[PDB]
Amino acid sequence: RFVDDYLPALLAQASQLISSEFHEVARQHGFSVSEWRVMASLAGSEPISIGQLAQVTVTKQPTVTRLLDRMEARGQVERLPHITLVRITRKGLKAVEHLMELAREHERRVLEPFGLRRAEELKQTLRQMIDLHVH
Amino acid sequence: RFVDDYLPALLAQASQLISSEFHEVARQHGFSVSEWRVMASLAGSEPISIGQLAQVTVTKQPTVTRLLDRMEARGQVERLPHITLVRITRKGLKAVEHLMELAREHERRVLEPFGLRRAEELKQTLRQMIDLHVH
Secondary structure, rough: OOOHHOOHHHHHHHHHHHHHHHHHHHOOOOOOOEEEEEEEHOOOOOOEEHHHHHHHHOOOHHHHHHHHHHHHHOOOOEEOOEEEEEEEOOHHHHHHHHHHHHHHHHHHHHHHHHHHHHHHHHHHHHHHHHHOOOO | OOOHHOOHHHHHHHHHHHHHHHHHHHOOOOOOOOHHHHHHHHHOOEEEEEHHHHOOOOOHHHHHHHHHHHHHHHOOEEEEEEEEEEEEEEEHHHHHHHHHHHHHHHHHHHEEEEEEHHHHHHHHHHHHHHHHHHO
């Protein structure tokens, strides 16, 4: 069966299933998926471009700009001139800190059956693939 | 930086980047993304339920049903009673065979820098994660 071992389908299914688990927690804590992805991607980071944010949040850039309009209105992020850069504010960081701890706990549960060796191998392969395929 | 090693973000980015590469080929060959995912998921398979198809194609079930309405109108798939089952027709298989070969070639290019050992480890870990997290 073609799809059983086809890499793009395997990545798409694993990503959907694991993300959907944590997105439920995010909503129970008052976050939309896109709001969570933006705040998680900006936490602890220097200001990054809107295009970089769109890539790491796997969201199209026009959608991201519209998201940032409302999140900046709420004081959770700030856009700045360098190309537009964007950063999380202290308000946004404090809003998402607890959720980030829950996200780390969920990740630890997802990876514990695989062991540290296989978990680190997976993360390294994924990071290498991203860095090879990003534009 | 939280997101740099956060598994759901790594899976989401790797999946988006690799899928987007092949989706371009699919469209240049006259397929929409959803049409390609359905035909690729049914190729060489026994009839599966609509819910199973929705899971493997990472598409919501109502969207899948509407997709199958039009694909069945075009004679590319067939729905059957067991719960509704669905299968690819000979017409659909012949329509997608060449694209499937191109998909295998693209996958081989994506995985060749990693070597057979790391490629097989990645596919095994992804398959295990899917089977643990599917509902």
